[PDB]
Write a protein that binds this DNA or RNA. Structure first.
Ligand SMILES: Nc1ncnc2c1ncn2[C@H]1C[C@H](O)[C@@H](COP(=O)(O)OP(=O)(O)OP(=O)(O)O)O1
Ligand SMILES: [Ca+2]
Ligand SMILES: [Ca+2]
Ligand SMILES: [Ca+2]
Ligand SMILES: [Ca+2]
Ligand SMILES: [Ca+2]
Ligand SMILES: [Ca+2]
Ligand SMILES: [Ca+2]
Length: 902
DNA sequence: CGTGTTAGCAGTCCGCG
DNA sequence: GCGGACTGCTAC
């Protein structure tokens, strides 16, 4: 097999590299790497090296890496460009793996771990590590084994060994319900004392050194705790055995009260799953505890126990250890679903970077572009310093706030990357400028045609047509992967609906789920078999279709993020290829395109509907337009339609056969106008929206920019079995809105769009009546606790103190001296509740760490002093009034002359 | 060491015979 | 007590 790297580090003049060899064995080598950098030279000098603008360069081959670095300094002091890859480990990788890396994950040691630390004096701070590590579960991807390190004797208690037999037993038998499929994978190691546990752990670590190290919060707790604990017991050099190159870097963060650390372990690529989740999941969660995320991702129940965690080991060691093991498995289960490790590996090897650099789009792109240019013997420019300047972005139309009965939306595919490719926007393809007319003038095609010769953006930039730029070239490759995965995703989505439709009439028989690939549309034969399957088999098939869809989603949306991140990088001062002309060329072209196509759609629809001068396009944002289809429906008359699906079919046909070709013509013309390199403005029908036929449903509404709701029947070729609500920007979509309120506001919206005012009024009355019976956590607001200290004036609110911060401060006063009441962590999320006047807390609100029950010592009082009235008004009523006034609808029956009657 | 801009709502502070 | 300027937080 072809070789591939595992990790790479620069330490002084040495590259330290862990890799897999031709036989597939792990190896480590140290290399005194001899880097090259480049300087411009005279044209009269014959060379094979050119900068990206075609200017000749000369190679400087250096004796070592410090010399190369010191040369860059001397060049800076002289005032001349020092060209080439200045991050030497990227160059090393590029030299060593001068081919498309084909890697084998089965050879990569992925470690997943978590530790327990009993602490009677509050949170066990990793910087201090003053408490014993009394449990470690470490899963190894190569052994496929959970290695359990269990401390039996501690200052905080001596316990008996943990029982695997009892762990496997159901909770109802008094066991821990450790999932049966990992029971056989556990290797259990008890210890009489901490020192020998840790010694064994280190020696185990040396045998099975992680390449990828993951888990939940390992970066902020587990890794620094282990490191510091081993340091305090055996000394720093022993703690340094955690690095395969015996090298660590310790950096301390301080603010006012608490002190924290993150430890860099050289030769390991740490990918904290919480970080992967936050970057790649496209959620925003009210809490980031593992219990919460596992429940959200896996529908697994919360790992409940009696008493505080500080006493769980002594009171129930059996469960303590079992929960350590389960918490580690849960991360593996989440990754089995979301596949972020797979994505990080794909991305990392594709770019040729340290795997941990997938968190940096800038490092990723710099690496991709460098490798692309190196292949052509081209030399990359030196990074330069730039002041941060603002620049203009996308166009968002101001909608008339109203209900909108029938809506069809249209969307441009992967817009900004498409603009990059259409216009041929790159650092080295800039041809020159033209004098700009006002934007309105291009939108309306009255402005003089920018160029007969070059490809143009309405920001005034001109580009070469007859040569590809590195940026369009490289963005196209990733765009094309993204398209492949999205196709698989939509196919699995469509397959999902075929199953949901078949679950309407399940068959009374015992069979099994069909062996199929959900990434492709079910054939007619498969569809015929599905109609005859049992509910049990269909539901297993639906589960698999949905797992296939999530997998295709992870893969497509994060490739999308990466390419869009190349657009943004052009507007980041740290990017080697930072250029506000290129960034603005993209955004201004986008503004033109959206508004150009608005006019063309309005023109076309007035033509075919035989009217003149009316606004069919009701909204637009960046790359998408929303068309009122009322007059399309009215042109034929509703009476002609048999059912909902009928008119949906009608609009589907209308959009695809009539509108899209008009849109295509429209953009073809715009491309000619800007004299662009390749037409890539592909605007296709997105959603079809309306109320059920014959209902009193209103179909949809806008309240303002970025705030709207639609009852959608078809989305990107997916015909839903049941209508799905597409809600954007409204409180139902916000993580700060209480869970139960999201649920109630969504049902309010469902009723408005599908059923009508009267149905809405029925629900509202019911929810107002039962509001005060809801669980306090379900009705708490949520927020991030940033800059707590900045508003902390003797434990009281300082000037302009935010509501949620006031709540935290109130909490801090109430838990003063509680010793082991959970502290609010800076930057983390809290639940928030308003308090009635005269409460024992001495303020109008309280806040506590989210995903948790508020501590028992103050819980009673919180429940007693909650202001439900304020809570209802602020979280539910005020937003609902916003929705209903926009839709010209009432949530409460208004008074009228009829009230005089019985 | 480090993708981007556009945009609404909640809250504090301030003015307000 | 309701607006306007301001911070803080949260669809493309
Ligand atoms: N995370 C982001 N970073 C930078 N720019 C973004 C981001 N999200 C969106 N944009 C900009 C660039 C996008 O091309 C444009 C439109 O975004 P979006 O509506 O998500 O669809 P898209 O056209 O990029 O892709 P799709 O093919 O999924 O429709 O807005
Ligand atoms: Ca734990
Ligand atoms: Ca789009
Ligand atoms: Ca689309
Ligand atoms: Ca059937
Ligand atoms: Ca869009
Ligand atoms: Ca089309
Ligand atoms: Ca109390």
């Amino acid at each position: 097999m072809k070789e591939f790297y595992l990790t790479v580090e620069q330490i002084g003049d040495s590259i330290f590299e862990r890799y897999i060899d031709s036989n597939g064995r792990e190896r480590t080598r140290e290399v005194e790497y001899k880097p090259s950098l480049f300087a411009h030279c005279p044209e009269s000098q014959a060379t094979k090296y050119f900068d990206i603008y075609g200017k000749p360069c000369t190679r400087k081959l250096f004796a070592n890496m410090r010399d190369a670095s010191q040369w860059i300094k001397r060049m800076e002091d002289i005032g001349l460009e020092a060209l080439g890859m200045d991050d030497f480990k990227l160059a090393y990788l590029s030299d060593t793996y001068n081919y498309e890396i084909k890697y084998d994950h089965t050879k990569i040691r992925v470690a997943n771990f978590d530790i327990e630390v009993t602490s009677p004096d509050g949170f066990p701070e990793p910087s201090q590590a003053k408490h014993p590590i009394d449990a470690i579960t470490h899963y190894d991807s190569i052994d496929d084994r959970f290695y359990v390190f269990d401390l039996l004797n501690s200052p905080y208690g001596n316990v008996e060994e943990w029982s695997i037999e009892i762990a496997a037993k159901l909770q109802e038998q008094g066991g821990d319900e450790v999932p049966s499929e990992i029971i056989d994978k556990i290797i259990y190691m008890p210890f009489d004392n901490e020192k020998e546990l840790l010694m064994e752990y280190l020696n185990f670590w040396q045998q099975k050194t992680p390449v990828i190290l993951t888990g939940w919060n390992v970066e902020s707790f587990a890794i620094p705790y282990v490191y510091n604990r081993i340091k305090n017991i055996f000394g720093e050099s022993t703690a340094k055995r955690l690095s395969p190159h015996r090298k660590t870097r310790v950096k301390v963060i301080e603010n006012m009260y608490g002190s924290r650390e993150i430890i860099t372990l050289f030769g390991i690529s740490v990918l904290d799953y919480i970080d992967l989740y936050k970057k790649f999941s496209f959620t925003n969660q009210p809490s980031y505890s593992l219990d919460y995320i596992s429940e959200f991702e896996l529908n697994v129940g919360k790992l409940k126990y009696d008493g505080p965690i500080s006493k769980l080991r002594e009171s129930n060691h059996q469960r303590y250890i079992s929960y350590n093991i389960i918490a580690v498995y849960r991360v593996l289960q989440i990754d089995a679903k979301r596949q972020f490790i797979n994505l990080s590996l794909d991305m990392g090897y594709y770019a040729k970077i340290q795997i941990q650099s997938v968190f940096s789009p800038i490092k990723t792109w710099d690496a991709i572009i460098f490798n692309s240019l190196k292949e052509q013997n081209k030399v990359i420019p030196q990074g330069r310093s730039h002041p941060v300047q603002p620049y203009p972005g996308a166009f968002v139309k101001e909608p008339i706030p109203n209900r909108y009965k029938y809506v069809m939306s249209f969307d441009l595919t992967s817009l900004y990357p498409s603009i990059i490719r259409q216009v041929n926007i790159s650092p080295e393809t800039i041809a020159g400028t033209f004098k700009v007319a006002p934007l309105h003038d291009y939108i309306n095609a009255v402005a003089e045609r920018p160029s007969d010769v070059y490809s143009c953006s309405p920001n005034g930039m001109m580009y070469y047509k007859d040569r590809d730029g590195v940026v369009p070239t490289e963005i196209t490759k990733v765009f094309n992967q993204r398209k492949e995965h999205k196709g698989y995703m939509l196919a699995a989505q469509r397959n999902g609906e075929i199953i949901k439709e078949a679950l309407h009439n399940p068959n009374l028989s015992v069979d099994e789920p069909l062996d199929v690939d959900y990434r492709f549309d079910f054939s007619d034969e498969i569809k015929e078999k599905i109609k005859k399957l049992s509910a049990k088999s269909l539901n297993e098939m639906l589960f698999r279709a949905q797992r296939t869809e999530v997998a295709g989603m992870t893969a497509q949306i994060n490739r999308k993020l990466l390419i869009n991140s190349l657009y943004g990088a052009l507007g980041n001062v740290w990017f080697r290829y930072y250029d506000l002309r290129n960034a603005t060329a993209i955004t201004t072209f986008g503004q033109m395109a959206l508004q150009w196509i608005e006019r063309k759609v309005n023109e076309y629809l007035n033509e075919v509907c035989g009217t003149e001068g009316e606004a069919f396009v009701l909204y637009g944002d960046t790359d998408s337009i929303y068309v009122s289809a009322d007059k399309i429906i009215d042109k034929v008359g509703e009476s002609k339609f048999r059912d909902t699906n009928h008119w949906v079919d009608f609009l589907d046909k209308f959009a695809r056969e009539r509108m899209e070709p008009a849109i295509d013509r429209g953009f073809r013309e715009m491309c000619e106008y800007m004299n662009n390199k390749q037409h890539l403005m592909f605007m296709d029908r997105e959603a079809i929206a309306g109320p059920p036929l014959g209902s009193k449903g209103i179909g949809g509404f806008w309240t303002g920019k970025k705030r709207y709701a639609l009852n959608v029947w078809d989305m990107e070729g997916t015909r839903y079995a049941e209508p799905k609500l597409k809600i954007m920007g409204l409180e139902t979509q916000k993580s700060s809105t209480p869970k139960a309120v999201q649920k109630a506001l969504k049902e309010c919206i469902r009723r408005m769009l599908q059923e009508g005012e009267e149905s809405l009024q029925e629900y509202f009355k019911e929810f107002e009546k039962e509001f005060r019976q809801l669980n306090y956590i379900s009705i708490a607001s949520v927020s991030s606790a940033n800059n707590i200290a900045k508003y902390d004036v003797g434990g009281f609110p300082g000037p302009k103190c935010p509501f949620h911060i006031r709540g935290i401060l109130t909490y801090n006063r109430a838990i003063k001296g509680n010793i082991d009441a959970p502290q609010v962590v800076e930057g983390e999320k809290v639940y928030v509740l308003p308090l009635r006047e005269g409460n024992p807390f001495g303020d109008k609100c309280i806040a506590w760490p989210s995903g948790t029950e508020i501590t028992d010592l103050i819980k009673d009082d919180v429940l007693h002093w909650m202001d439900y009235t304020v809570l209802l008004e602020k979280t539910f009523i005020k937003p609902l009034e916003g929705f209903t006034s926009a839709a010209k609808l009432d949530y409460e029956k208004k008074a009228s002359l009829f009230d005089m009657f019985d």
